[PDB]
């Protein structure tokens, strides 16, 4: 529109808080926050995670205790990540679909106690394989796509059976969203949402999560260099029946968030991963960055087009928003 | 290629949490601007029958009510003086009187509540004996460029009174650039200009005329025209507006959406007196639930508006706060 | 209509060769610009605690380290003088001192390494006693146009010292055109201007303030705003910038991508002190592998950046060379 | 953005090498190069090709020798083109799917020796027909589409059986990508890539290749005049399950490359064909053009949007890049 | 949703008639412009070894060959004088000599063949002792604005000689507007300007240098850059060019297509000496069929070019005529 | 691009023929022309058509005579329109698929005599029904869609059997392109093109054609007021397997031509119908318009994006072009 200085001075709107507030393009609210949480097998158990300062692994009872306050703060949903006892790992990943596995038990407990709180279970075989790869290995050590799906489908069904409102397949197998959706539909789980991890990269930013849960990748997770490829990933997942789509990691992939939102106009989520949390929190603890950087990081996801954010900062942010 | 039953759009609707996760727009108090009707005198409060629950207030009373507005976090007020009949003239000179209602109210509010935004109305219709939005020629037509000269003096007077934003509502061609030039020349470099860019010749304004004590088809836009609005806004952006506005509101949500999409600039919309009246009337009759107020406001957010001029601003801010 | 199992996106991922064939972006040393902190004096080297592995260097020491930078193929340096406290003033006059640190360092580097690009910082904050990015008025607000006058003299002084690029980081409106006019008028026809176009009011700058020995919401952009950045860059292109920049970096990759896509112009991004610190801290703690450095830089390429201002430039150039 | 001289002087960035380097939009790297290679039946055999100065036909053992250096140079992949003994040609093109045909043998030898090097086999009947047409002829002498596909499918399977990571159908039969993909999938060759020659023109630029391999076309290859048609070709091939799509010839069709990349955002390849190589090399040899024209020609493909380039200059370019 | 076997793209290919019906582009003689090398003297004809079948011709001989060109319907010639070594100078003054080869040839052709288009080359490289495309400063760099002054005088001299089109090939910034202003000021209101807008620093020019008897990376474009070309052409259109050109040709067909698509303006492309040589060489060796000539030219039409500067213009016009 | 007078004077290019020629955006050639022709049942028969001055109905032998010259002129194709004897009309339209109907006979005669000339047969029931409606009527007098298709399919097969290279379904039944394509494919007529009359309007401009062939419509032909609807029509026909798509009438619908070409980038044809021919020719004959209006009318179709034009002026235009 031929806007030219000095007729246009972009500073005028910035002059006063009230005008800054009037033109502010995006706001983060508690509607936008999803808290991931590492769940242990026992009773009366909490563990600190070395590479995620301030985040605890919680047994189910402890989860239920802390969830009262997450609920009170208005956090809409949790994303559960079980911490599988080593003795329950196997080459067939069968613990994935064990009806009394951690995820399944946590889910039923939370669904009963906090009926309005959303529960997003993780559909993935890496927490359950003795080797830690995101699926069933062939003789060469390659992750078999279609065979891994069969396990994933049985897992997802078990989650729906436990009452999960959302299942989130994080594996990066091709075709899995459609196979899971078909199974859910066949089984009558009409309303179970599927939150696809659509554009999940082969990233160095996951380091701490491995420490958190107790666990090559380039043959299934995406190359960091690729952008256009992410749109093809998403497109397939929407076609296959995903209700929501996700980019992971998050800040390092904000451009992807923006392209995905712009291209598909579908419910788009983003994961501020363990390494992102660790680097921010470590800097805040060292006195190198102000705590205000938490809300800045989260505001960036909204600005980029995310509808919702999986973030280990969800409770702190909710607290800050509520002020 | 999303297809039922693989895709069932009800799934995200099943639970409040999922509805919240996917909700595309939120209204907040940061979106609300309260228009106010300002009387001369002291201790004056007058009800408006066609705008139930809205009062015209003298300045002292405005300062009192403003305590609450500020407490609720409403970012700005839009002042509309109720000009005494005796102060109306052919030349509209009260528009730039340093002792006019708008200028006095501005000075009062700027002092008492320094963080509150004040948006003054730049317009000659409140000041003319004939009520037209400008100075007439000998054929009874509103002269564009001569009217701008008066508008410029008004705008300068508002800036001198401390207004952070002036909002030209006149629909004169070229007035945004002329006002901008004048502001700049005078050293008022940070006074915002909130252009009423796409202001339609509308029947929705009935009650406001009641409220302020006052056809426009040779200046106000034809309701039928939509492309025309883009041309209006493009010129006002080129001429230096800091924000652009569509008026009326809800009957023109398509315009809001086109303007936001085309220009990606700060976009405002006026939910006019007629809109407020319609909704109030229906609520008071028990024909609509009070929930319609937040619905109407959410519409503006959804259509692309950054801010909303609305007589519901206090009612809504209270509901949002809680 | 690509659909599984006819389309399996894993197939190109199966082998390194195919991953290489389809790889959409590559980082090279041609993408790297090293910011440097420059001290007055001789034989000075100072570690920065909040930026582990980065030192502030006096000019003689800078010349020494620069041998390696040049050997590694780093195309340019961005100089940031560490102004002695005694040289800060209300008028920011050290900004245009021919004997200032920046001007001296420029002259030294231009002579010793004629092919190395030197990008000077055009900004008044390093030179004011109050640390604000300009000259204050009597209300304590940074005056836009008066600050530009000082910026213009600074920019001319950098050109006189031989800088091939000046990078205005101030966030004054209109400053790119004013600097351009001045450069042109003076015969500095080929001095590039690298506008910091979309520079946000960010918490990520903490460590830099430590490094150079120094709110900005009335000039720096609101983190929440994205469309606004397009307007910023459009003006700076119109005003004559040769390259445009987004700052900070990684928290604003969406902005980089929007700016590249909209304008198709040379686009740069600053991976700021806070970003470097976060990553370094996590690497030193064993929380992240050192591979994150090239990942972070690749992100900027993927988002559309042509060049990256990064304190990792040497570490990355070494890794790329090998 | 209203950029106007003298405020905008596009020469400023060009003033110095460092700024030229900073704004340079595209770079060619060895990641972008695919070397086509003509493979003979014997042992200890090399032949010079008259119309491709500097390019040799190589027996398998010789191929393995030269490949050490292609590998050392970082060339990611080869595209194999067998030189069929005349005695092995027939009206049924059966040699195409012979498990001990040249392509199959070369493939197994290279897969074993250089496991990381990509092998792209040619799925085409023209090297195998007594007549040299790209398929099986009917009584009128027309190339039968669906009957030719059946042979092509058997060929592609035989290549996957030999270990090829990519099969590249170059025939221009309609529907072939889907038929090959279905067959590969049915057979369990889940990860064998299909590099479709999607927009392959009826071009005069192929002349030397006929000399190289020892071999109307307008009823299957595209009319040079047509652009929009190429987008329809590509679209079908992506829908049919191609992993990569290719334009051939290359320089003479750079506009097609750009439209294809822009429209589909998919992995896009381009073939700098025998006639392009010959005309450049002949000019360089005559002293008419500088050797720098090699990297200029290849940079154009990147600039146009190609991800990868099949080029007889791959070794020379790799050498030049490595300096 | 076109899908095999319902859609078989071979069907339209089955028969020549259907191929003709659907053919998207045709080359005609109206698309061809013949560049010519012009010698001083009388009765001179010189073969160029690196451009087999092309001769440099003195003016009298050019007039003779032109009879055939005109008979074949070739719309225009692009004249390239072969400057005597003794007429080259630091100041490039032969460029605007009314008695220069270009000016004489123009006058001769305008008289003898009034309907034939004459496109003169506006450029200083044929006239400088050093061969650079402009006037050098004391550092050996081509001064942009001083070179334009000489270019303007050249262009005026071509207009005075009767040229219907001047084609600035220099790659000076701003030269199209400066030449346009001058033409307009002088009353040359209908002299076309054919800007070489996107002219790359290319190895394809080798033979031309042979032909006319003569790095450029500080003015000619980097082969790697494509977005940059849009900026080049946008400026030249704004500055008043009537047609815009890409050079070289076939190695830059993506550029042609981007330029046509973006601007929808008259777009021309130069199939340069190196391109002609490559093709000729291969044809003479029996490596390519002569059909490649029409294929190469069709490519330019397909990419979006309106006109093609090509040394094959006569060969192709003969083939088309028949 | 900020082009402004007097720096930009759009007249400069117009100053001289040579520059007009250089920038001329579109050219009509004989490659673009398709001649419709009304074919009678007899021998040695020609009839003049009152409302189409200058156009004759021709028996097959006469058609073959005139076609030598159409061929000599380079006209690529004819579109045949038989003139059905009244005695051969019926409620079932069976004459449509009679192997010795006029169209079928003309086709075989022309295919044999002029093998390179394209023949486009008309797939339509209106020339064959006693009532003249474009299909089989129900009790209410409505044209039954799916029942009419069955006849159309049998017609099209009979045309392919006669050797037609293109069949052109002009009926405006929904779904017909797909049904015809399926049938052709099932029958092995792999290469028979289908030229869909995709956007065919309920127009007053067809008046003379009824006079020519010897023959409500608003329930199948399109409303003249509708534009967007034409894109939906076309889209369906491409999806159903049309090789070419057509707009009819022509000049009065040039906007449709442009939108269709722009939207689909597919081979697009346009019919300059009988009423368009009549009004031009009547004006030329009255001395009201110059003959140059013929090439102007045809140039408009090219300008609008048409690849080919069905026009009763094809011979005159070809003659004019050849000069
Ligand atoms: Cl007026
Ligand atoms: Cl200011
Ligand atoms: Cl210069
Ligand atoms: Mg307890
Ligand atoms: Mg996927
Ligand atoms: Mg207006
Ligand atoms: Mg700015
Ligand atoms: Mg040996
Ligand atoms: Mg195909
Ligand atoms: Mg230029
Ligand atoms: Mg006879
Ligand atoms: Mg239809
Ligand atoms: Na949200
Ligand atoms: Na707002
Ligand atoms: Na770069
Ligand atoms: Na590549
Ligand atoms: Na042309
Ligand atoms: Na055509
Ligand atoms: Zn996993
Ligand atoms: Zn008014
Ligand atoms: Zn600053
Ligand atoms: Zn073949
Ligand atoms: Zn030159
Ligand atoms: Zn019909």
Swiss-Prot record, chains A, D, F:
5-aminolevulinate 2 binds at residues 274, 312. The active site is at 200 (schiff-base intermediate with substrate), 248 (schiff-base intermediate with substrate). It is an enzyme of class 4 (lyase). 5-aminolevulinate 1 binds at residues 210, 217. It holds the Pfam family ALAD. InterPro entries: ALAD (IPR001731), ALAD_AS (IPR030656), Aldolase_TIM (IPR013785). Mg(2+) binds at residue 233. Its EC number is 4.2.1.24. Keywords: Heme biosynthesis, Lyase, Magnesium, Metal-binding, Porphyrin biosynthesis. GO terms for cellular component: cytosol. Stimulated by magnesium ions. Belongs to the ALAD family. Homooctamer; formed by oligomerization of dimers. This is Delta-aminolevulinic acid dehydratase. The lineage of its organism: Bacteria, Pseudomonadati, Pseudomonadota, Gammaproteobacteria, Pseudomonadales. The gene is hemB.
Swiss-Prot record, chains B, C, E:
Its cofactor is Mg(2+). It is an enzyme of class 4 (lyase). One of its GO terms (cellular component) is cytosol. InterPro entries: ALAD, ALAD_AS, Aldolase_TIM. Stimulated by magnesium ions. Disulfide bonds: none annotated. Its EC number is 4.2.1.24. 5-aminolevulinate 1 binds at residues 209, 216. GO terms for biological process: heme biosynthetic process; porphyrin-containing compound biosynthetic process; protoporphyrinogen IX biosynthetic process. One of its GO terms (molecular function) is porphobilinogen synthase activity. The keyword Lyase applies. Gene3D superfamilies: Aldolase class I (3.20.20.70). Mg(2+) binds at residue 232. Belongs to the ALAD family. Homooctamer; formed by oligomerization of dimers. This is Delta-aminolevulinic acid dehydratase. The gene is hemB.
């Amino acid at each position: 529109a031929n806007r030219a200085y000095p007729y246009t001075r972009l500073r005028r709107n910035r002059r006063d808080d009230f005008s800054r507030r009037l033109v502010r393009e995006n706001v983060l609210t508690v509607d936008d926050l999803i808290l991931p949480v590492f769940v242990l097998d026992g009773v009366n158990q909490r563990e600190s995670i070395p590479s995620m300062p301030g985040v605890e692994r919680l047994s189910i009872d402890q989860l239920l205790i802390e969830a009262e306050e997450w609920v009170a703060l208005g956090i809409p949903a949790l994303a559960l990540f079980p911490v599988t006892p080593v003795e329950k790992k196997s080459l067939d990943a069968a613990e994935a679909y064990n009806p009394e596995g951690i995820a399944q038990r946590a889910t039923r407990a939370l669904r009963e106690r906090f009926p309005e709180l959303g529960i997003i279970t993780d559909v993935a075989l890496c927490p359950f394989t003795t080797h830690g790869q995101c699926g069933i290995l062939d003789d060469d050590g390659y992750v078999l796509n279609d065979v891994s799906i069969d396990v994933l489908v049985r897992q997802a069904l078990s989650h729906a059976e436990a009452g999960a409102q959302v299942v989130a397949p994080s594996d990066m197998m091709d075709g899995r969203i459609g196979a899971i959706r078909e199974a859910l539909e066949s089984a009558g789980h009409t309303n179970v949402r599927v939150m696809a991890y659509s554009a999940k990269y082969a990233s160095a930013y996951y380091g701490p999560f491995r420490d958190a849960v107790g666990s090559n990748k380039a043959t299934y997770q995406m190359d960091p260099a690729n952008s256009d490829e992410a749109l093809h990933e998403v497109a397939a997942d929407l076609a296959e029946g995903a209700d929501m789509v996700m980019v992971k990691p998050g800040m390092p992939y904000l451009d992807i968030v923006r392209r995905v939102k712009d291209e598909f106009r579908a419910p788009t989520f983003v994961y501020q991963v363990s390494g992102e949390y660790a680097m921010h929190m470590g800097a805040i603890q060292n006195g190198w960055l102000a705590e205000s950087v938490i809300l800045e990081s989260l505001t960036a996801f909204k600005r980029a087009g995310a509808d919702g954010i999986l973030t280990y900062f969800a409770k702190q942010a909710a607290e800050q928003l509520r002020r």
